[PDB]
Structures are given as structure tokens and as C-alpha cells.
Scaffold this active site. Structure first.
Site: not given
Ligand SMILES: *[C@@H]1O[C@H](CO)[C@@H](O[C@@H]2O[C@H](CO)[C@@H](O[C@H]3O[C@H](CO[C@H]4O[C@H](CO)[C@@H](O)[C@H](O[C@H]5O[C@H](CO)[C@@H](O)[C@H](O)[C@@H]5O[C@H]5O[C@H](CO)[C@@H](O)[C@H](O)[C@@H]5O)[C@@H]4O)[C@@H](O)[C@H](O[C@H]4O[C@H](CO)[C@@H](O)[C@H](O)[C@@H]4O[C@H]4O[C@H](CO)[C@@H](O)[C@H](O)[C@@H]4O)[C@@H]3O)[C@H](O)[C@H]2NC(C)=O)[C@H](O)[C@H]1NC(C)=O
Ligand SMILES: CS(=O)(=O)N1Cc2cnc(N[C@H]3Cc4cc(Cl)cc(C#N)c4C3)nc2C1
Ligand SMILES: [Ca+2]
Ligand SMILES: [Ca+2]
Ligand SMILES: [Zn+2]
Ligand SMILES: [K+]
Ligand code: NA
Length: 804
Positions: A159, A261, A309, A420, A689
Site C-alpha cells: 500500500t 483491500d 495494487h 498482495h 544508471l
Molecule cells: C528516478 O528519478 C530520480 C529523480 O530524478 C532519480 O534520482 C535522482 O538521481 C540522481 C543520481 O543518483 C541524484 O542526483 C544528486 O543527488 C545528490 C543531492 O541529493 C539530495 O537532494 C535532492 C534534491 O532535493 C533530494 O531529492 C535527495 O533525496 C534523496 O536522499 C534523501 C536523503 O537520503 C532521501 O530521503 C530521498 O528518498 C532520496 O534518496 C534517494 O536518492 C539518493 C541519492 O541522492 C540515494 O542514495 C537513496 O538511496 C535514494 O535512492 C537528497 O536529499 C547530489 O549530492 C549528487 O551529487 C554527488 O554525486 C555525483 C556523482 O555523479 C558528483 O558529481 C557530485 O559532485 C556529488 O559527489 C559527492 O558526493 C558523493 C556521494 O556522497 C561522493 O561519493 C563524492 O566523492 C562527492 O563528495 C547527485 O547529483 C538525485 O538526488 C536523485 N533524486 C532522488 C529523488 O532520488 C533516479 O536516478 C531515477 N531512477 C532511474 C533508474 O532513472
Molecule cells: C497504509 S494505510 O492504510 O495506513 N493508509 C492510511 C491512509 C489514509 N489516507 C490515505 N490517503 C491516500 C490518498 C492518496 C492518493 C494519492 Cl494519488 C497518493 C497518496 C499518497 N501518498 C495518497 C494517500 N492513504 C492511506 C494509506
Molecule cells: Ca493497499
Molecule cells: Ca550505475
Molecule cells: Zn492489503
């Protein structure tokens, strides 16, 4: 602590949530145990129920009533939803003829058509047909609007991962909600359905639609509803918000139902108890649509009816226990059920070994109902690896089954009949999509699509720029009457080199041999023409792929195939060839078994060498263009060029040779020719990537020849199979795969058998979208077709699922 002594007077279902210790009156206050003391009395009125009756028509307003049937109710915006039907002789919306909505027909002061998302939990795709007789309101939305036969969820088919994907357009690995239960080792914190940790914003990544709207000046209703708020009250709350002044009124709303569900877990997807929940959801849709008709909004609002789902038959007896496989079951933590995730119980335990756990779980029982994976080895289409919250050890559970740690987990915690969470290509997990309103098309069927694509469309519907996401913006333009998104193809970053003959044979010291010394100006002219690209229009049907990053590569032409050859990775990025229905398969002649030929267009320094393969006792080689499908004995020599060779484990060569020798010909026979683009993928950090060179973890021993993690193929033909692939006037058909380049066939439990009994099953599991291969390669395909770019974007998102 909350000061509950405050009051909800004039604040019921207020849109901005107040900060502790101030008491709350919003649609989530119950979930935080933070509502003001008078929230139930003022905000959850129930008196006289949810429907007007003839005796209430024109009643004196009684503010105690759940909803009103007084003459002033339309003005106050708080009529019962059937008021105009009971009291003013109107029809229910569902009884009205479908009439095309060509333009928004909105009240003065509406700046844009509102969007209402009607989200249903566990609503399996086949309910739209199987439940049609008990869901007239939903069937009218479906038939009169735009609908897909099904919508594909994300993995895992749980969910919160799916709702949050709908909200963000992101895969779970990117938005961070990777299950309904999670441990984050960096936070040292656990997320559960029950309790307060899940409310902490640190779990929730990306930018969900209500934030995207608010940041761009579009007001949002809050999308989450506390469970005890009845559905009728949720609908009346949305309708009341839609009666707010223009500057206060949201433009986007969501309704949520826990049904079907909740009942499906108890009764199975098709239990006879499931008819009543479907009827009740339908009645709720009818309340919404009658309510909108009362407000003169029924030809103004866009309504999305969407599920998270589906639901499968699963019983407590169909449970696999890890205690029947592992010696060490007390040393692991299992996230159980319709998927498994394994990690060490203690990080202080130095005897913990993932390799011994995987081996103990691999093909140990003849009908084993789960398969273990290291997460990087999961099918790339699941996009389920690049998050620290995803354990390294994953169990893909067969549909209809569970996995648990020990038997006592199943009866010291049953009676359930549905569940699911399985692989998102499983038919039972598919869910629903209907769009109805001015911006959607009229009486239109669209092919199935993935839920990651919806965020972009919801942004299109609201005039919002989407945050960066995993949708392919434009791929769903065919759902829309207006507000289409018309992107330009990405610009090519690297231009190819077109090398001619530049090197003599004796300049090569590669350790290669070939029996190719066999000496006619008829054919010598022809040889030259083919090397300059005279057959390229047959083999490169959709243009050269564009290279979207900075690199050095060469276009190499041949009689039977064209390639883009990387001077940095020492192998093709892509190889393109066409196989007609009439093509003949041949053998690799005995004298050519070990033939590798220097390519006099490419320097020795930018070539592979045979000595590295001889010295590397684990690694062998294959060819991208298959020698089996040569057009002639003479053309076959091209297939043995060093520029067509790629590193392949012997175990993988069993797979690849079967594909090349048997399956390509089979597909050409079935599809009336195919065009094949094949190549390597390097994704050592499992982020989906293209790797840069400094990310490569393995080379062919003693060389700079990098080892691919995967091999792809894109197999394109004419959707009208009466036209051959190379003379297609219309839409295309594609199937693709991303095969893991593994040193064993441990994934295939029947791999001791002939390849005819297991290789195509492996390839189906690793089916892919062209877009998946684009991300993994930095290439852009289908640059030169006769087709609209949005149609090509839809083709690039297609997944061939191999479900019945
Ligand atoms: C699906 O679509 C998404 C969205 O477009 C895309 O994901 C994006 O991919 C990019 C590459 O992997 C990445 O770009 C830069 O990221 C950071 C900045 O990150 C922060 O800021 C952004 C903007 O607001 C946030 O969205 C981001 O959220 C992530 O992290 C949060 C805290 O951890 C978390 O809550 C959230 O869920 C999200 O996590 C996810 O992404 C991270 C990576 O950011 C993963 O680690 C997690 O597992 C999870 O998947 C952040 O708060 C920049 O700092 C990067 O720059 C780095 O790396 C470069 C290398 O290429 C380098 O050139 C730079 O100089 C810099 O390097 C430095 O840091 C290195 C690493 O720490 C270090 O080794 C090095 O030596 C040096 O010091 C990236 O430019 C985006 O963050 C990412 N966004 C999101 C939303 O995920 C997906 O790729 C696609 N998927 C497909 C398959 O197409
Ligand atoms: C897991 S659960 O039973 O604990 N739970 C309780 C609860 C209450 N309200 C909602 N509202 C949904 C309605 C909606 C539509 C779209 Cl387009 C995206 C998102 C997101 N994100 C959501 C949240 N969903 C849940 C799911
Ligand atoms: Ca569900
Ligand atoms: Ca790769
Ligand atoms: Zn369920
Ligand atoms: K070898
Ligand atoms: Na095997």
C-alpha cells in the site's frame, strides 16, 4: 503533549495543520491523538444519517444534522449528496446519458478544472469486468471517460510504496518507502504501519503532488484521512472544500478507501463476501458525482479512479519456512510475507555470512515457492536495489505463497485468504485507472501503463511543472484531450567517428588467430560498399541511437550489422541488425571456432586482445552480432572481428548462444522479421544508471577490458505483422530484456537441462522497457521513425510481461 482544551469551532477539516501543543481539527488529527476535545461533536456529526428523505425537504436547518436538506444547503455547500434528487426532482448522475465534455463547464471564479483522485486500496484490475453488474457509477466513469485495461503497480505491491509512488512519480528505491515495514541503518529507526515513527518526514523522499502544487501556487486538500472518519464524511468534506471562496479553495483533492483491500485479505479476491464492499465503493462514487452535479461541477472536475495494487489468493498453509532450510535461523532477521528481506540479527555477529545463507536457500526443494537474490541480481525492471533500507538478501516469493522464519510466526500471530506484495508483473497484482473529465478523452481505451507515469499527468492536469521523477513525460499524452506535454528529443552529446582502413594486420599483437587466408573486382567493390554503409538502411531501421554523454566512439558498418564501438570501454555500446522471416541459421564452421580477427579500422590500442581471455580462467567471450545469422559464408568473417567481441562467462554463454542461435530466428518467424539492437550494460552500483569508467569493479584479468553486469537486446518489428520489420508503414511492436551477466546459472534451478527448458523462462523474468535500457546506457533509441514523438515515448515505456 497536546492542549486538547482548545476548540474546533469554525475549524472543522481546516486545511493547514497547527503545531503542537495546539489541538488539531484536520482530517489526520485522530491519527496523532491530537484533536481538540470537541472535534467529534462539531466535525463528525452523524444525526439523521447521510441521505435526504421527502419529509426533510425544505426543513428548518438543524446544525446538529450530518448533512442538510434545507433550502439554504446549496448556498452553505452542506446538502446531503442526494438533496437535489430527493427534493428538487433531479436524476442521479449515474442515470444520465454519457455526454462528451469537450470543454470545462465551470462556475464563475474557477481558474482551472479541479482534480479529484478517488483512490481505492486493493482494487484488482479484473474487478472492473467481474464486478461490473454491482458498480454502475464506476462502470459509467470507465465507459464514458478514458480507461486502461489495467495499471501496473510498483514492487513491492504494498500500500504505502504504491500510494507514495502515485504521489511522487518515483520508484520506491528513490522515494524511500520500500515496504510497509522498514529498518534504516543510518537512522537506526524502524518504520511500521502501527505507530508514530512513520509520521517522521525523514522517511518520505521526493516531492509529492500536494507539495508540488503548493510550491507553484496551487492549493491542495490534505490527502490522508484518519481511519475512523466515515467515507460519507470524507466525501462531504471534499464537497464543502469545493464551496470555499476562490482564494481559499483547493484545486486538487484525494479521497481514500481502505476497501476492497480490508475484506480481500479476509475473504480472498473473489470471496462471495467481496460483492458488498464493491457495491459500497460504487455508492460512494455516486455520492461524489451527485454532489458535484449539485455544485454544477460534474462537467468541470477531472476525476481519477485509481488503485494501489491488486489481491491474490494466499492461505496460512501456503507458507515456506526458513527454519526448513537454514541451520542458523536465530542469527537472521526476516521481513516476511509476500516478499522476504534478510539481514543479520546482530551486526556484532562476525560468523554471519550472506553467501552461506543464499546457498542454503537456492534450489533446495523441488517445488520451492521462493527464490533468493542478492538485490543487485533482481530483475532490473523491479528497480528495487538502490536504497540502504533494502536488505542485500531478497526473496522473490511465488504468487499465492508466503515466506516466514519459523512455523510459530504463522499461528502465534490466522484465517486470512488474500494478500498482495508479489512481483509487479503478476496478473493478480494489477490495479485500475480511469480518468473522467474535460481534460481526459471521451470513450477512450488506452493500453496498460505503469503507475510511475501518473504524477506527470496529474501535474499536466493542474498546470504544474513536475519535480524530477521516473515517469517519461509525454508517454501518457494519448490519455488527454488538452494539456499535452510536448518534449523535444534529447540533444546528442557525442558525435561518432567514421573510421576507414587505417591499420595493417601486422600492427596488431593481440594473441588472436583466424583461419581466414582465402583470396574478384565484382565482389571487391561490394566489400567496400558494405564497409561504407550500403546496407545500413536494412540494419539500422530507426536511426543511429544518440549518445547522451561525452565519450569517444566509432560507427562501424558491415554487410549484416552496424555498431557504435566505444574506444573507452573497448567494445560496442550497441549493435544493430535486421533478421527477415526468410533468414537462414548456419553453424560456426569448424575451422572458425576460435577465430578472432583484427579490425583494420580500429587501433590496436583501442582493441580487446585474445591473450587476456586465454589468461583469465573464469572469463570467455561472445559476439554481439551472432555468427549463426550471417547472410553468407563470406559475410560471416565480419562476425569474428575483435570489434564485435564482448566478455562472457561460460555459464552466460549458454544463455546467449541459445538466444542467438534459436530465439532470434524464432522471433523473426513469429513477428515477420525483427530488428535487434544488443549491447553491454555496466551498473556495478545498482542505481539503474550508466556507470562511468571509474565505477567498474571487474576487468578481464590483466587488461582494461571492463566486464558488463548485464547484456540487453531490443527486438522491434511492425505492430501490423502482415508487413515485414524492414518495410513497416505504421506503429511498432517491441520486446526487450536486460539479462544478468552471471558466472553461474544458480538462478535457473533447471539449468542442468537443455537450454530449451530454461533459457526463455530466464529471459521472460528479465523482460525490460526500452526506457530501462536508456537509463542504463545513456543511449536514446528510435530517433528516426515516421511516428509522433509521444507515440515513441509510449513504445519506450512498454513492458512485454508474458502473463496470460
Ligand atoms: C528516478 O528519478 C530520480 C529523480 O530524478 C532519480 O534520482 C535522482 O538521481 C540522481 C543520481 O543518483 C541524484 O542526483 C544528486 O543527488 C545528490 C543531492 O541529493 C539530495 O537532494 C535532492 C534534491 O532535493 C533530494 O531529492 C535527495 O533525496 C534523496 O536522499 C534523501 C536523503 O537520503 C532521501 O530521503 C530521498 O528518498 C532520496 O534518496 C534517494 O536518492 C539518493 C541519492 O541522492 C540515494 O542514495 C537513496 O538511496 C535514494 O535512492 C537528497 O536529499 C547530489 O549530492 C549528487 O551529487 C554527488 O554525486 C555525483 C556523482 O555523479 C558528483 O558529481 C557530485 O559532485 C556529488 O559527489 C559527492 O558526493 C558523493 C556521494 O556522497 C561522493 O561519493 C563524492 O566523492 C562527492 O563528495 C547527485 O547529483 C538525485 O538526488 C536523485 N533524486 C532522488 C529523488 O532520488 C533516479 O536516478 C531515477 N531512477 C532511474 C533508474 O532513472
Ligand atoms: C497504509 S494505510 O492504510 O495506513 N493508509 C492510511 C491512509 C489514509 N489516507 C490515505 N490517503 C491516500 C490518498 C492518496 C492518493 C494519492 Cl494519488 C497518493 C497518496 C499518497 N501518498 C495518497 C494517500 N492513504 C492511506 C494509506
Ligand atoms: Ca493497499
Ligand atoms: Ca550505475
Ligand atoms: Zn492489503
Ligand atoms: K578464459
Ligand atoms: Na542452475
Amino acid at each position: 503533549w497536546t492542549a486538547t482544551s482548545g476548540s474546533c469551532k469554525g475549524r472543522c477539516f481546516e486545511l493547514q495543520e497547527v503545531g503542537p501543543p495546539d489541538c488539531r481539527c484536520d482530517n489526520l488529527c485522530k491519527s496523532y491523538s491530537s484533536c481538540c476535545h470537541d472535534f467529534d461533536e462539531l466535525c463528525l456529526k452523524t444525526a439523521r444519517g447521510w441521505e435526504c428523505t421527502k419529509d426533510r425537504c425544505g426543513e428548518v436547518r438543524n446544525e446538529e444534522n450530518a448533512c442538510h436538506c434545507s433550502e439554504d444547503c446549496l448556498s452553505r455547500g452542506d446538502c446531503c449528496t442526494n438533496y437535489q434528487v430527493v427534493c428538487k426532482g433531479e436524476s442521479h448522475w449515474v442515470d444520465d446519458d454519457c455526454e462528451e465534455i469537450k470543454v470545462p463547464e465551470c462556475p464563475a471564479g474557477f481558474v482551472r478544472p479541479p482534480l479529484i483522485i478517488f483512490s481505492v486500496d486493493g482494487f484488482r484490475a479484473s474487478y472492473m469486468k467481474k464486478g461490473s453488474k454491482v458498480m454502475p457509477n464506476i462502470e459509467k466513469l470507465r465507459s464514458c471517460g478514458t480507461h486502461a485495461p489495467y495499471m501496473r503497480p510498483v514492487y513491492p505491491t504494498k500500500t504505502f510504496p504504491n500510494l507514495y509512488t502515485l504521489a511522487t512519480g518515483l520508484y520506491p528505491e528513490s522515494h524511500g518507502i520500500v515496504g510497509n515495514s522498514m529498518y534504516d541503518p543510518v537512522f537506526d529507526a524502524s518504520f511500521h504501519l502501527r505507530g508514530r515513527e512513520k509520521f517522521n518526514h525523514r522517511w518520505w523522499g521526493g516531492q509529492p503532488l500536494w507539495i508540488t502544487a503548493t510550491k507553484q501556487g496551487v492549493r491542495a486538500g490534505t490527502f490522508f484521512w484518519s481511519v475512523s472518519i466515515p467515507h460519507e464524511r470524507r466525501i462531504l468534506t471534499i464537497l464543502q472544500w469545493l464551496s470555499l471562496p476562490d482564494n481559499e479553495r483547493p484545486s486538487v483533492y484525494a479521497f481514500y478507501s481502505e476497501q476492497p483491500d480490508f475484506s480481500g485479505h479476509k475473504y480472498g479476491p473473489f470471496g462471495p463476501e467481496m460483492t458488498n464492499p464493491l457495491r459500497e465503493i460504487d455508492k460512494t462514487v455516486g455520492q461524489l458525482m451527485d454532489g458535484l452535479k449539485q455544485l454544477r461541477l460534474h462537467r468541470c472536475v477531472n476525476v481519477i479512479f485509481v488503485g494501489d495494487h491488486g489481491m491474490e489468493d494466499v492461505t496460512c498453509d501456503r507458507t515456506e519456512f526458513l527454519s526448513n532450510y537454514l541451520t542458523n535461523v536465530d542469527d537472521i532477521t526476516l521481513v516476511p510475507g509476500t516478499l522476504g528481506r534478510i539481514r543479520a540479527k546482530s551486526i556484532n555477529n562476525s560468523k554471519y555470512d550472506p553467501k552461506t545463507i543464499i546457498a542454503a536457500l537456492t534450489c533446495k526443494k523441488p517445488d520451492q515457492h521462493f527464490k533468493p537474490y542478492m538485490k543487485q541480481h533482481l530483475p532490473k525492471r523491479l528497480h528495487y536495489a538502490n536504497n540502504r533500507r533494502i536488505e542485500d538478501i531478497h526473496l522473490l516469493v511465488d504468487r499465492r505463497w508466503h515466506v516466514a522464519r519459523k512455523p510459530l510466526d504463522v499461528y502465534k500471530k490466522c484465517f486470512f485468504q488474500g494478500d498482495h506484495g508479489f512481483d509487479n508483473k503478476v496478473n493478480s497484482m494489477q490495479t485500475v485507472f480511469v480518468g473522467y473529465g474535460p481534460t481526459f478523452k471521451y470513450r477512450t481505451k488506452v493500453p496498460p501503463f505503469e503507475n510511475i507515469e501518473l504524477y506527470n499527468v496529474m501535474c499536466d492536469l493542474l498546470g504544474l511543472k513536475p519535480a524530477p521523477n521516473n515517469g517519461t513525460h509525454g508517454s501518457l499524452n494519448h490519455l488527454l484531450r488538452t494539456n499535452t506535454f510536448r518534449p523535444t528529443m534529447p540533444d546528442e552529446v557525442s558525435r561518432p567517428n567514421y573510421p576507414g582502413i587505417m591499420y595493417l594486420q601486422s600492427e596488431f599483437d593481440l594473441g588472436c588467430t583466424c583461419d581466414d587466408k582465402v583470396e574478384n573486382k565484382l565482389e571487391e567493390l561490394n566489400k567496400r560498399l558494405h564497409t561504407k554503409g550500403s546496407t545500413k538502411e536494412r540494419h539500422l531501421l530507426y536511426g543511429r541511437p544518440a549518445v547522451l554523454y561525452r565519450t569517444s566512439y566509432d560507427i562501424l558498418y558491415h554487410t549484416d550489422f552496424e555498431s557504435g564501438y566505444s574506444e573507452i570501454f573497448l567494445m560496442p555500446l550497441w549493435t544493430s541488425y535486421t533478421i527477415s522471416k526468410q533468414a537462414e541459421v548456419s553453424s560456426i564452421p569448424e575451422h572458425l571456432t576460435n577465430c578472432v580477427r583484427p579490425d583494420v579500422r580500429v587501433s590496436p590500442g583501442f582493441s580487446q586482445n585474445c591473450l587476456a581471455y586465454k589468461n583469465d580462467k573464469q572469463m570467455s567471450y561472445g559476439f554481439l552480432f551472432p555468427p549463426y545469422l550471417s547472410s553468407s559464408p563470406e559475410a560471416k568473417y565480419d562476425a569474428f572481428l575483435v570489434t564485435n567481441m564482448v566478455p562472457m562467462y561460460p555459464a552466460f554463454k549458454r544463455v546467449w548462444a541459445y538466444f542467438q542461435r534459436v530465439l532470434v530466428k524464432k522471433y523473426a518467424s513469429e513477428r515477420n522479421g525483427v530488428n535487434v539492437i544488443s549491447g553491454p550494460i555496466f551498473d556495478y552500483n545498482y542505481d539503474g544508471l550508466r556507470d562511468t569508467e571509474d565505477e567498474i569493479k571487474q576487468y578481464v584479468e590483466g587488461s582494461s577490458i571492463p566486464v558488463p553486469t548485464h547484456y540487453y537486446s531490443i527486438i522491434t518489428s511492425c505492430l501490423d505483422f502482415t508487413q515485414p520489420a524492414d518495410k513497416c508503414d505504421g506503429p511498432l511492436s517491441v520486446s526487450s530484456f536486460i539479462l544478468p551477466h552471471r558466472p553461474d546459472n544458480d538462478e535457473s534451478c533447471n539449468s542442468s537441462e537443455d537450454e530449451s527448458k530454461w533459457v526463455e523462462e530466464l529471459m521472460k523474468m528479465h523482460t525490460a522497457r526500452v526506457r530501462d535500457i536508456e537509463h542504463l546506457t545513456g543511449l536514446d533509441f528510435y530517433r528516426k521513425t515516421s511516428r509522433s514523438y509521444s507515440e515513441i515515448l509510449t513504445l519506450k515505456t512498454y513492458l512485454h510481461t508474458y502473463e496470460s
